[PDB]
Write a protein that binds this ligand. Structure first.
Ligand SMILES: [Mn+2]
Ligand SMILES: [Mn+2]
Lengths: 65, 305
């Protein structure tokens, strides 16, 4: 099969910004109860508020509380 | 919508200390969401794009790196762009990041494109940082507005009938491109099926066919799957994102697939470069990298046990 794509043999490199990229990890501070409440919150949000096309309702991702 | 003012304020922090926030109003951000959502719905869910284009992988709220990437590649509309998703979560400035990308989609709707990553859905970005960032700076209702916008993002793109682009990867349920075109928006991302896989799957050199994915979601796929897919659809390359790679790009299956990752020094925990792939009008593909001078894989945290 004929292939059209080709790749350059030379990559351009420059220096990334030098700064502190560390970020908070809120998902490490979830108790079992917090997770249950988030599952419930998401379920209620997707059941009552989040608009979804009629032909895509089967794709909405619900959680087991 | 005061679009030009918004863009100028977003870009103004370029000369500033990293991490300076941009003070957009709630109503400005809502407008970015609503106007971009309309444009996403007016364009196909499977984009058909033409080179020249620069293609970028994950950003994850690393706003100062996004600014650097545009400085390096050319600020819109000097170059056309396609981003492969994962704009939010797991970085410090998801809001500025997504607001600039939505602003450029509205300003340059035929020259600037955004695909959906697995973090552009409610269940994932509820927990990996975006909801909390919205709540701190604005309110939960604004996060719900973002969700409505994300639920309308396109899912894949084909560049010049030859490069198939998506966030995650292939699916055992992908037999025809019409199956992508038939997906109706707004939609959530399901926990399994074609739309899940396009946003979640990974290549694996040791899998023959389809395998389990240790994210707890979707599949892995082998090199032979890639080769058969390209041959069936007369494509030359799969271009995807979704995994940190040391040089910002990494080939798979004798260069039949490439992974792009555009957030250097990801989360301050990895020593990777961020890359973009520039495709010229002759379909010559080149890489521009910004190099610093599984822990990183999002999985099934909220639902496992
Ligand atoms: Mn990612
Ligand atoms: Mn991802």
């Amino acid at each position: 099969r004929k292939i059209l794509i080709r790749f350059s043999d030379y990559v351009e490199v420059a220096d990334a910004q030098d700064y502190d990229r560390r970020a908070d990890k809120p998902w490490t501070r979830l108790t079992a109860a917090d997770k249950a409440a988030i599952r419930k919150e998401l379920n209620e949000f997707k059941s009552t508020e989040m608009e979804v096309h009629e032909l895509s309702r089967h794709l909405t991702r619900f959680h087991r509380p | 919508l005061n679009l030009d003012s918004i863009i100028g304020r977003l870009l103004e922090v370029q000369g500033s200390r990293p991490g300076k926030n941009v003070q957009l109003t709630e109503n400005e951000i809502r407008g970015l969401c609503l106007k971009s959502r309309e444009i996403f719905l007016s364009q196909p869910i499977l984009l058909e794009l033409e080179a020249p284009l620069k293609i970028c992988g994950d950003i994850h709220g690393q706003y100062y790196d996004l600014l650097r990437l545009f400085e390096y590649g050319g600020f819109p509309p000097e170059s056309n762009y396609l981003f492969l998703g994962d704009y939010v979560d797991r970085g410090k400035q998801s809001l500025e990041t997504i607001c600039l990308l939505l602003a450029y989609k509205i300003k340059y709707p035929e020259n600037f494109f955004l695909l959906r990553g697995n973090h552009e859905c409610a269940s994932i970005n509820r927990i990996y940082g975006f909801y909390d960032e919205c709540k701190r700076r604005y309110n939960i209702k604004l996060w719900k507005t973002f969700t409505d916008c994300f639920n309308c993002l396109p899912i894949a793109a084909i560049v010049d009938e030859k490069i198939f682009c998506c966030h995650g990867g292939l699916s055992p349920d992908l037999q025809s491109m019409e199956q992508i075109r038939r997906i109706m928006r707004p939609t959530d991302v399901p926990d399994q099926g074609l739309l899940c896989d396009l946003l979640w799957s990974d290549p694996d050199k040791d899998v023959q066919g389809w395998g389990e994915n240790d994210r707890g979601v979707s599949f892995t796929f082998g090199a032979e799957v890639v080769a058969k897919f390209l041959h069936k659809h007369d494509l030359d390359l799969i271009c995807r994102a979704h995994q940190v790679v040391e040089d910002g790009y990494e080939f798979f299956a004798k260069r039949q697939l490439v992974t792009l990752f555009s957030a250097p020094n990801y989360c301050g925990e990895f020593d990777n470069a961020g890359a973009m792939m520039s495709v010229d009008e002759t379909l010559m593909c080149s890489f521009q990298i910004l190099k610093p001078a599984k822990s990183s894989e999002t999985g099934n945290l909220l639902d496992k046990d």
